[PDB]
Design a protein around this ligand. Structure first.
Ligand SMILES: *[C@@H]1O[C@H](CO)[C@@H](O[C@@H]2O[C@H](CO)[C@@H](O)[C@H](O)[C@H]2NC(C)=O)[C@H](O)[C@H]1NC(C)=O
Ligand SMILES: *[C@@H]1O[C@H](CO)[C@@H](O[C@@H]2O[C@H](CO)[C@@H](O)[C@H](O)[C@H]2NC(C)=O)[C@H](O)[C@H]1NC(C)=O
Lengths: 50, 50
């Protein structure tokens, strides 16, 4: 939202292509690929005596 | 592609917002929600004395 309001002519970094982000600025092609994954602690597979 | 090359001023239909399509044209707000699902045959688990 600063790039739209002319404060920074280009934001370089971890900026991730979302749909309303592509409306207001105009990205390049992606230079790395990312997706949301879920990390969670590893645990046992067995339940109760039930 | 026939809106970028200005043969049509507006494509009204079932056009789905993808992150190239938001890049080359402008969309409205999403008036209906959609997502890719996987349809498949149901489980027909039999039950008989056979
Ligand atoms: C998608 O991104 C746009 C761009 O920032 C968001 O629109 C802005 O929303 C803030 C809310 O405080 C306000 O400054 C304005 O309504 C918008 N800024 C503009 C037009 O410069 C929009 O809210 C985002 N969508 C969602 C669902 O969060
Ligand atoms: C991304 O979307 C665009 C639009 O369909 C495609 O990129 C180019 O778009 C121009 C329109 O001005 C066409 O003339 C080019 O032929 C398109 N490039 C190619 C290689 O066909 C592009 O097809 C889309 N990206 C992907 C991966 O399909």
């Amino acid at each position: 939202n600063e790039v739209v309001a002319d404060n920074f002519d280009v934001a370089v970094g971890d900026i991730t292509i979302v749909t309303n982000r592509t409306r207001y600025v105009d990205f390049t092609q992606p230079f790395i690929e990312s997706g949301l994954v879920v990390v969670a602690p590893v645990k046992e597979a067995k339940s109760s005596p039930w």
